[PDB]
């Protein structure tokens, strides 16, 4: 009988509790429970360091994939590469820090071979940058607001083999680098991106992070532009797999896991 979960903050839309658990009665794990808990970047080593020893595992979202990184005594070499986490493991003899956001770009993709452009500079950016590298994009231009967060994803880029550049939502440059790109990853929240719709509508591929509220702004503007549009329930499926095989350590039953996702309203 284990426990696992998810922390954030905002943490009540969260679908990932409806994900796990269709795996863990996959597993036939059925007394396994995963519930939402509401906790922000600064109080999350109060709350996993409170965890008991049926813990075996917790996802991270939003606010608190740096701090899970910090937190964690051994991280992969994934969460290593990309400089936060969205998956703590319990151990031993303490926690290990990884990251699925990777897969969750990768598999929600599917494929992609070019010019990609990437918003935002949170915890989910740099798993997007790894992902498009994983995928074998040529070349990344990091949008952000925080300039300085943005020249750490440029390095990241640079570092997995990706000629990277930064260029700012206002200042002139956002039209030109949409007209080059061929995939949109959208990390920033669906209120700022709102604002540059109009100008980001001309992507062919979107993958919005956000899955709730649906569809967002600039889901609805690239699809009405004839955009391809990913939700954020398929990031969301795609690195549940490899949360759940860690939280288990049982392969993913991604059968019903699909069929949970398709469950969702
Ligand atoms: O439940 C959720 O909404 C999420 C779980 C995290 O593991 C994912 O990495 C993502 O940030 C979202
Ligand atoms: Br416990
Ligand atoms: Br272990
Ligand atoms: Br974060
Ligand atoms: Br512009
Ligand atoms: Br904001
Ligand atoms: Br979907």
């Given at each position: 009988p284990k426990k696992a979960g998810v922390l954030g903050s905002p943490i009540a839309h969260s679908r990932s509790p409806q994900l796990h658990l269709a795996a863990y009665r996959a597993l036939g794990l059925h007394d396994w429970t995963y519930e939402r808990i509401e906790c922000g970047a600064a109080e999350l080593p109060v709350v996993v360091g409170g965890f008991?020893?049926?813990?075996?595992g917790v996802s991270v979202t939003m606010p608190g994939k740096f701090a899970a990184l910090r937190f964690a005594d051994e991280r992969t070499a994934r969460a290593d590469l990309v400089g936060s986490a969205n998956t703590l493991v319990r151990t031993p003899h303490g926690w290990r820090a990884d990251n699925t956001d990777i897969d969750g770009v990768a598999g929600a993709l599917g494929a992609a071979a070019g010019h990609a452009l990437v918003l935002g500079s949170g915890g989910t950016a740099p798993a997007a940058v790894v992902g498009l590298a994983e995928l074998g994009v040529t070349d990344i231009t990091v949008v952000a607001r925080n300039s300085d967060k943005a020249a750490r994803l440029v390095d990241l880029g640079t570092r997995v083999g990706v000629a990277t550049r930064f260029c700012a939502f206002d200042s002139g440059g956002l039209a030109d680098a949409v007209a080059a790109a061929e995939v949109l990853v959208s990390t920033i929240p669906a209120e700022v991106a709102a604002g540059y719709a109009g100008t980001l509508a001309a992507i062919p591929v979107l993958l919005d992070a956000?899955?709730?509220?649906?569809?967002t702004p600039l889901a609805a503007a690239v699809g009405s532009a004839g955009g391809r549009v990913i939700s954020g329930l398929q990031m969301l499926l795609h690195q549940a797999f490899a949360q759940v095989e860690q939280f288990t350590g049982l392969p993913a039953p991604r059968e019903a896991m699909t069929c949970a996702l398709a469950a969702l309203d």
């Open positions: 008991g020893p049926e813990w075996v956000i899955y709730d509220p649906w569809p």
